[PDB]
Amino acid sequence: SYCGPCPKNWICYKNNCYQFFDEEKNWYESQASCMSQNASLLKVYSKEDQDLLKLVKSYHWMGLVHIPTNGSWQWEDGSSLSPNLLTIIEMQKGDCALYASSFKGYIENCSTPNTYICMQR
Amino acid sequence: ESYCGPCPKNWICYKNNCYQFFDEEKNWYESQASCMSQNASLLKVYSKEDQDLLKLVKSYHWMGLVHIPTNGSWQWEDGSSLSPNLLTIIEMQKGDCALYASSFKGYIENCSTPNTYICMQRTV
Ligand SMILES: CN(C)C(=O)[C@@H](NC(=O)c1ccccc1-c1ccc(C(F)(F)F)cc1)c1cccc(C(F)(F)F)c1
Secondary structure (H helix, E strand, C coil): CCEEEECCCCEEECCEEEEEEEEEECHHHHHHHHHHCCCEECCCCCCCCCHHHHHCCCCEEEEEEEECCCCEEEECCCCECCCCCCEEECCCCCCEEEEECCCEEEEECCCCCEEEEEEEC | CEEECCCCCCCEEECCEEEEEEEEEECHHHHHHHHHHCCCEECCCCCCCCCHHHHHCCCCEEEEEEEECCCCEEEECCCCECCCCCCEEECCCCCCEEEEECCCEEEEECCCCCEEEEEEEECC
16 A cells, blocks of 8 residues: 655654654744744644654654643644653753653743654655 | 555555564574564565665564575575675674664674574565
């Protein structure tokens, strides 16, 4: 069976498209980058459908944003984080999060430059 | 925007090649057998441009490159020759097998030492 469709130089896995970007940018720059490729930052919605994320090395911006006037974490598209997907770990005071294996999110200052993962589907 | 495949459903697809990582440690022969059982072979490096994803592969993993001591040449398990300009082969341990390491390096290793490995299917 075929996987996709996905941009030419992207990784395809269970019909989701992923791309790693090694240029370090703040969270806002990274979101803008994925958007310019008609994608978004990594969104984690299923350990089963996205089990390749166990294989990811290093730490990378994903699309999770913290709403301080709530107790809320949400994805870019406004959807909620569902249960048993990410272990959220304090690291720095901030409103953004870095993905790390295995299915961890480290709270990070949105202004700090990091590598990032875009995702499309 | 195109499709990638054909591949098995739980394999990674990149530029119409299928990849799978296995973190169980096996000697070279058992690693090759495991790839073959899934209609695949150990990693073969044929193109820096079309396999540039290999720049992101960390640590050391079996690939399908073997040594013919009687002639000193390196070749892939299927008998095909190693293209120039692709891999830098570096001594490590006395052996007739090679581990892939980034970036586009081959480290000589004892074929009987268990290591993690990478399987690959071409779709030609
Ligand atoms: C053995 N090993 C498994 C690695 O070295 C590992 N390296 C890094 O993840 C890796 C290493 C360094 C920098 C970035 C990454 C990386 C980040 C995100 C993605 C993403 F875009 F895909 F999200 C892919 C790679 C790996 C290599 C190739 C493919 C994959 C996989 F994730 F696609 F499966 C993982």
